[PDB]
């Protein structure tokens, strides 16, 4: 016997609620699954709609309704309204609204310029591809008015794939399952992070180079601590807003470069005051700026 | 053959609250009432019959038609409390239910704390097209407000409503691809008093106070107080970041914080440039630097 051809349509209303630490995101949408069963008799020989709690009564009476699992859903999805549409020719359409937490690999190392791929993976829970196979998949997403107010900028239409997953721990040709894969590409909106985080940080790090224009070893060294303290004061401003991650981002590296630059100046200032009154090396008012930008370009090689 | 079932709806909004700026969501607690006419029926004493909560299921199982209405723009399943059917002998059926749901809508907070929002509710049958079920009318009733000084949002105008038809391209499987939709909209403006006195006013005094570096008489004093000022904006930017909402774009306050940085930074440059090019003449920019700031501010 041939497998049941199941046609799938996924409507995505919203993708939001990224949890950087857990690498998860929420997806609100509809899922539609259509297949052809045996013909049946319906009231007035017209399509029959069966909603929510009444679905259970048809299943208990024999109506085949396979469970399709979201491979990458975290916990049970929040399923709202759902209906069946039973045609007399045998066609069956299952339609349900869902809100689920979904996971996938997410790399935030180029924050705030990172680019992510939001994925949904769908697969029958119990029926292999000799019994149930996905014949096609179509995706429909939100028509965006303007994205300037949005946190993520969608890039391209939804990508789809239909593949076969072969499991080695189910022992003839009965260990392959049909899997749908949907992917939404998006880029982070960096405007806020550019103006309120990166820019003020550059000013703070640049302003620490002003110590070299002070005409007293006393002034230069003392003010270096006020700068060190300014980078720290800025540290918990970024830590309180930027996402929690198990690795360093771009901004983080800037912050670390800031710590070193100020700490370097402390050494040079002290080194200048005991090397020979070396106001010539104290004229490193250009070396320090140049050295930082050089190492700064190398930082963003990823 | 038969015409569509006409459904009259009434929505009672108790509270719009719990705005989540980054998720562009908001919480709505209220009641939904849906009335239509069914096949005339017998009722005890020929008075309206009342069916509550779990008992409603028994009636749907016994053949009673109760169409499912979905909040198109609700995020997740709404929290439904008590629900009730009222069946009249003449056929009228009135469905009533308490709901609490999170709703989504395009919300632009760029003018914060002076932003205006349109909270909406979109109602649409889940399964029956507008050849089987259409919305005949919609009535909206909102809360009676005493004094809005304590309220985060100030409502403006009466709630607007719309009844329209939604046509879906993917439902070409004769002419039953259209659905009736109700739309409610609540216009409101934010209460900025809190943000003016506790955020914009202090930040003004700080940015202004930084301008007094041009009144210190030694060069080593101007440049070192500038770091104290720089450090005050940093401490203040963090005070704001801990209270003001999270957004993917800058607001008025953010641009002020940024302007505080630029003013202090530019001043630090003018202090050094004037020193190595002890020129106290340009140090008389006590009036030039603040004006240039305000001039650029308009732009």
């Amino acid at each position, epitope marked *: 016997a041939r497998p049941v051809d199941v046609s799938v349509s996924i*409507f995505i*209303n919203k993708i939001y609620g990224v949890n950087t630490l857990e690498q998860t995101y929420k997806v609100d949408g509809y899922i539609v699954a259509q297949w052809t069963g045996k013909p049946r008799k319906t009231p007035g020989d017209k399509p029959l709609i069966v909603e929510n709690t009444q679905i259970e009564r048809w299943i208990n009476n024999g109506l085949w309704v396979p469970a399709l699992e979201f491979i990458n859903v975290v916990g049970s999805p929040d399923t709202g309204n759902k209906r069946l549409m039973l045609f007399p020719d045998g066609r069956v359409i299952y339609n349900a609204r869902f809100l689920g937490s979904f996971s996938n690999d997410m790399d935030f190392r180029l924050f705030p310029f990172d680019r992510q791929q939001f994925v949904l993976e769908l697969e029958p829970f119990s029926y292999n591809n000799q019994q149930l196979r996905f014949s096609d998949i179509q995706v*429909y*997403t*939100e*028509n*965006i*008015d*303007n994205e300037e107010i949005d946190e993520w900028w969608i890039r391209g239409k939804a990508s789809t794939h239909i593949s076969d997953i072969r499991y080695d721990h189910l022992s003839p040709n009965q260990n392959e399952f049909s899997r749908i894969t949907v992917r939404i590409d998006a880029v982070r909106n960096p405007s806020y992070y550019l103006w309120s985080f990166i820019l003020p940080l550059g000013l703070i790090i640049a302003a620490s180079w002003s110590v070299f224009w002070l005409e007293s070893f006393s002034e230069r060294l003392q003010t270096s601590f006020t700068c060190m303290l300014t980078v720290v004061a800025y540290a918990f401003y970024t830590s309180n807003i930027l996402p929690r991650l198990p690795y360093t981002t771009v901004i983080d590296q800037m912050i670390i470069a800031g710590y070193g630059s100020i700490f370097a100046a402390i050494l040079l200032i002290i080194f200048a005051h005991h090397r020979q009154d070396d106001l010539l090396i104290q004229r490193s008012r250009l070396a320090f700026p140049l050295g930082f930008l050089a190492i700064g370009s190398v930082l963003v090689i990823r | 053959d038969a015409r569509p079932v006409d459904v009259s709806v009434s929505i009672f909004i108790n509270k719009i609250y719990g705005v989540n700026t980054l998720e562009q969501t908001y919480k709505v607690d209220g009641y939904i009432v849906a009335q239509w006419t069914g096949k005339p029926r017998k009722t005890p004493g020929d008075k309206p019959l009342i069916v509550e909560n779990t008992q409603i299921e028994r009636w749907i199982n016994n053949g009673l038609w109760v169409p499912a209405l979905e909040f198109i723009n609700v995020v997740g399943s709404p929290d439904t409390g008590n629900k009730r059917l009222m069946l009249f002998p003449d056929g009228r059926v009135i469905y009533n239910a308490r709901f609490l749901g999170s709703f989504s*809508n*395009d*919300m*632009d907070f760029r003018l914060f704390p002076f932003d205006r*929002q*349109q909270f*909406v509710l979109e109602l649409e049958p889940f399964s029956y097209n507008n050849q089987q079920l259409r919305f005949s009318d919609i009535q909206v009733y909102t809360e009676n407000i005493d004094n809005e000084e304590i309220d985060e949002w100030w409502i403006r105008g009466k709630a*607007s409503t*719309h*009844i*329209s*038809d*939604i*046509r*879906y*391209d*993917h439902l070409s499987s004769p*002419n039953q691809n*259209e659905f009736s*939709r109700i*739309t409610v*909209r609540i216009d409101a403006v934010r209460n900025p008093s809190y943000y003016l006195w506790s955020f914009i006013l202090p930040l003004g005094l700080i940015i202004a106070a930084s301008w007094s570096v041009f009144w210190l008489e030694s060069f080593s004093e101007r440049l070192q107080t500038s770091f104290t000022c720089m450090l005050t904006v940093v401490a203040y930017a963090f005070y704001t970041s801990n209270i003001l909402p999270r957004l993917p774009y800058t607001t008025v306050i953010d641009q002020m914080i940024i302007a505080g940085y630029g003013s202090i930074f530019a001043a630090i440059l003018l202090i050094i440039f004037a020193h190595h090019r002890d020129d106290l003449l340009i140090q008389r920019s006590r009036l030039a630097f603040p004006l240039g700031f305000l001039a650029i501010g308009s732009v």
Partner: nanobody
Amino acid sequence: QVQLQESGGGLVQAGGSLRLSCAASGRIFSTNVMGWFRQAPGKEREFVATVGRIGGSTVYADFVKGRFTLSRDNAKNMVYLQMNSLKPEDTAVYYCGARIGGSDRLAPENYGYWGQGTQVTVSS
């Protein structure tokens, strides 16, 4: 920013057909924000059609009853309103507007950059 120009309307007998076109030019990266409105002398400007939030959907006024169709051409920044089975009640000047903001596709308040309009007349 942008500017809108309607065209394609005229005189037609009850039951005929017309195809209105609206061309947009300026700072507009998508035609999703464009919407058709009509306004006959004596009544207020009422909504007709615009795109739906989810892909594949379209919002029509209750008086369309499936007779009008909104099509798109994102490449040419143009929208088209195919009006069939016209009635004498459809007589009006049909306006094309671009959505400024808010969050109500149906409210003209949220629309700006209106165009001159195209007169649509339907006789018996």
